[PDB]
Amino acid sequence: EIPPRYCPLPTARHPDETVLARRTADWIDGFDLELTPQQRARMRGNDCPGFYGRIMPHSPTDRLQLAVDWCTVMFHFDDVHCDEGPATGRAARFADLATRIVRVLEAPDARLEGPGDTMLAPVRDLALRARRWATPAQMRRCAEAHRAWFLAVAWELGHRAARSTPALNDYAHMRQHTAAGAATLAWAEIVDGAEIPDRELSSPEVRALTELAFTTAAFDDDLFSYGKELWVARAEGTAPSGLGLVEILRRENRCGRPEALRAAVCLCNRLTHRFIALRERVLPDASAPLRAYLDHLCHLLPGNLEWGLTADRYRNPDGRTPGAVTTTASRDTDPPADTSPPAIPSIAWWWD
């Protein structure tokens, strides 16, 4: 039971999810991943078309397919190449693969395949399709968003190998990157087909809006995937992972699980309010591509929640247990009473 979330933003579904699902399943099947039926079922439970369709419900299907296909292969990357394989040489293996992915995005004919490689062929295909539509700056943004994601995953793998729990001030600014927030959303302006001006994207107010949105969505992800984490921990007989806002607040405040859930939701509510309030100040002078970017972030927050609460990824985790985890949520219609910055110095500047 997730305490009431404040997110007064409308959500909508793309009308062509079935087509996007079919094409993305056909697309990923065309490479050399040797997907088992269990793996194909898990990808269905991921519902990539439902996810990105909620971010861009009005976009043309053939263009949105590019972002859906990226989600498809990167969910597989997460499940198969992040914190997997032999413990010996795990960090080195990840850094090796991660840098090849980034290079293929920059140089699709780099020919970096190794013995048994599977990931680079679809990545190359995404980069080649992206380059038909994207400006050079947009392609650069994709590569750098992937670097920020992958450096954060290397950070995260260190905590998982130590089974340690990050301090809140560290998690609070890193979580947007372990969630690949920017790498997920970089595809949007390519789908839209117009470059967001660098001076806008780089301005402090837009940087704040960007980090606010990606952090809120990732914390929401921590909340609607918490049940699956407790499921895994119970199956494997271990404590839940410390890589999650709920467990971080539980450890930091020496509180119960219900109290930590309330504190996590309270933080999400304050970030969401700040995003909305800062949005109102930025929109008057925003260019049309910036306005579209902020529209995508506005659909991301409620769309991410609806997707995460209803996708089988966080309800039937292994793909063989319908209803193993059921997460419920509420909508708080009242804004947070406290609109001041939280005592988290790594993110406090969002309230500047």
Swiss-Prot record:
GO terms for molecular function: metal ion binding; terpene synthase activity. Disulfide bonds: none annotated. Its EC number is 4.2.3.225. A motif (DDXXXD motif) lies at residues 78-83. The keyword ATP-binding does not apply. Residues 316-345 are annotated as: Disordered. InterPro entries: Isoprenoid_synthase_dom_sf (IPR008949), Terpene_cyclase-like_2 (IPR034686). Changing A180G: Causes the formation of an additional product. Pfam families: Terpene_syn_C_2. Its cofactor is Mg(2+). It catalyses: (2E,6E,10E)-geranylgeranyl diphosphate = cattleyene + diphosphate. Pathway: Secondary metabolite biosynthesis; terpenoid biosynthesis. Mg(2+) 2 binds at D221, S225. Keywords: Lyase, Magnesium, Metal-binding, Plasmid. A motif (NXXXSXXXE motif) lies at residues 221-229. The Asp-Asp-Xaa-Xaa-Xaa-Asp (DDXXXD) and Asn-Xaa-Xaa-Xaa-Ser-Xaa-Xaa-Xaa-Glu (NSE) motifs are important for the catalytic activity, presumably through binding to Mg(2+). Diterpene synthase that catalyzes the conversion of geranylgeranyl diphosphate (GGPP) to cattleyene. Cannot use geranyl diphosphate (GPP), farnesyl diphosphate (FPP) and geranylfarnesyl diphosphate (GFPP). This is Cattleyene synthase. It comes from Streptantibioticus cattleyicolor (strain ATCC 35852 / DSM 46488 / JCM 4925 / NBRC 14057 / NRRL 8057) (Streptomyces cattleya).
